[PDB]
Amino acid sequence: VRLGMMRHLYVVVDGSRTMEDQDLKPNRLTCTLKLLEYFVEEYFDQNPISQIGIIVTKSKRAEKLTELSGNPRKHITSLKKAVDMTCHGEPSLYNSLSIAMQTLKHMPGHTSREVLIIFSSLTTCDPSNIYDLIKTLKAAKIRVSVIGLSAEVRVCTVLARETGGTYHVILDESHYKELLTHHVSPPPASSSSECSLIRMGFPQHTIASLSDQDAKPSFSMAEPGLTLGGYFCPQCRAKYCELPVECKICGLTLVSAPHLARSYHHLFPLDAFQEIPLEEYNGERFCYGCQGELKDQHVYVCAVCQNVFCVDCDVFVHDSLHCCPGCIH
């Protein structure tokens, strides 16, 4: 199944009054922001080439809290600042989606444009009908996958299914974590989706040539002090503090080899290991994965290496490591 490795995602947060209601254990808005910080960090950790943008909608107006960027810390700071937001007004799906569409219209065709609307207040007061905007969204192939809160909104249901996204409603906080963690992963590319080669640039960390001879002093490029060494660009030739980042001049993505390598496991998903409770002639008391005695009647095995893994080993392998230790051999 074709997957879009590079995706520009907009997490549309609503500053509606209904967010005031403390349906969850803490305030709803505070919980959403606290978990969305984790979502942002994990999304960047699972898709370095991708970038994210936050639009906060309240009082019938949508404001770009943070433009598209490759730095998780800046977005995290924006979330922490927004934690104290007043949270009064009414959202406008038309306004939020129009802002997202305006920013995403000029984005490259190859990248997957995606929107995740964390809908809280079921109402949607908009200057213009949103069914018309749905046509433009379908034309622009911008995937929109709403996540409703305490409501199965019909307009958002049709939005999601027509635009190709998925609709969900929060059963509880634990299920909210699961929903956002699921949305972290790249979505499969459908027929409407198209792939195209994208120019990429690989910089190399550089320092003073020899005892600060013919040095290359520079401060930064988006109170930066002088830097003896740092990253550079093949074309900008402008010092960059951290990678990966889009060029401020070229418009070309600067990214190192490990960042790309971080996404190969998506192309190579791990086949689920059959769960057999009984020992099944497994005379090895120690679990091969962790070399620990199997204290539970559960075993996992591959179709190639035919090794033995306990519950923790299998869960960790399929969750984070994304590869079978013994089966690597």
């Binding site: 459908s190 027929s191 490029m221 002090g225 900008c236 070229c250 418009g251």
Partner: protein
């Protein structure tokens, strides 16, 4: 309409950096400023959009020998019973009308990932295997064999700052702001100069603007070295050469692509 003049007045003092750089491009009289922009309550409003009757009444009763407080007062002011229901029906209808304006993947070569971009007889294995098998028939020699004082002292001397494996200035402050400002100017103009440079753009109207921008490169880099000269003749310390690399590399790209265009022709 003087929309450009209105926008310039709006951004004249609201945003300092934008106007600072736009003015800087003219301070030394580099180029014309045309290309700069060429290339790049609630209740009353709600009533205004809600009640067309109120809109007509406002148009006809625009303040004339009256007061806005009086106009506000005029707002709130079975026959009455049905009027309320009719009024809600009409008002909700008006609000709604105002809101209603008129692929499975397959691959042939997977080992390329197994050996990614990272770069790079028979009896020898047998000999090594047997020798290492016979190596460790004796164990636990830690008492003296593992380490010796002379080697330990050599290791400590190496770990010393002058030793092996251990190799071992913010004096200017005001110059920092000037360097930052110059870098911002370079970035601003390089943005437009590189906006369409990577793309071939084999069209007459597309190439005209790259030619104009290429000339603008000469014209801006004409004035950059004069400020460089002013800064240089202070102490001849802490050389600023990174700025030179950007200009020289832009010139190299310009000339190389000009030669390539001539070759293509």
């Amino acid at each position: 309409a003087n929309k450009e003049l209105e926008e310039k007045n709006r951004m004249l003092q609201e945003d300092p950096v934008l106007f600072q750089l736009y003015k800087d491009l003219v301070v030394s009289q580099v180029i014309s400023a045309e290309e700069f922009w060429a290339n790049r309550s609630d209740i009353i409003e709600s009533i205004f959009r809600t009640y067309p009757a109120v809109k007509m009444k406002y148009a006809e009763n625009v303040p004339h020998n009256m007061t806005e407080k009086e106009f506000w007062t005029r707002f709130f002011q079975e026959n009455s019973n049905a009027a309320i229901i009719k009024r809600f029906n009409h008002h909700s209808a008006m609000v709604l009308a105002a809101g209603l304006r008129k692929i499975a993947l397959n691959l042939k070569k997977s080992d390329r990932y197994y050996h990614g971009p990272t770069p790079i007889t028979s009896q020898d294995i047998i000999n090594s295997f047997q020798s290492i098998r016979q190596e460790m028939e004796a164990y636990t020699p830690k008492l003296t064999q593992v380490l010796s004082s002379s080697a330990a002292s050599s290791t400590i001397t190496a770990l010393s700052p002058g030793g092996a494996l251990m190799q071992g200035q913010m004096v200017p402050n005001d110059i920092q702001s000037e360097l930052k400002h110059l870098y911002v100017a370079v970035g601003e103009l390089l943005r437009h100069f590189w906006s369409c440079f990577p793309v071939n753009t084999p069209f007459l109207e597309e190439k005209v603007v790259k030619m104009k921008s290429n000339l603008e490169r000469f014209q801006v880099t004409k004035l950059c070295p004069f400020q460089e000269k002013i800064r240089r003749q202070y102490l001849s310390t802490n050389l600023v050469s990174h700025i030179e690399e950007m200009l020289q590399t832009a010139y190299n790209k310009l000339h190389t692509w000009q030669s390539r265009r001539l070759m293509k022709k």
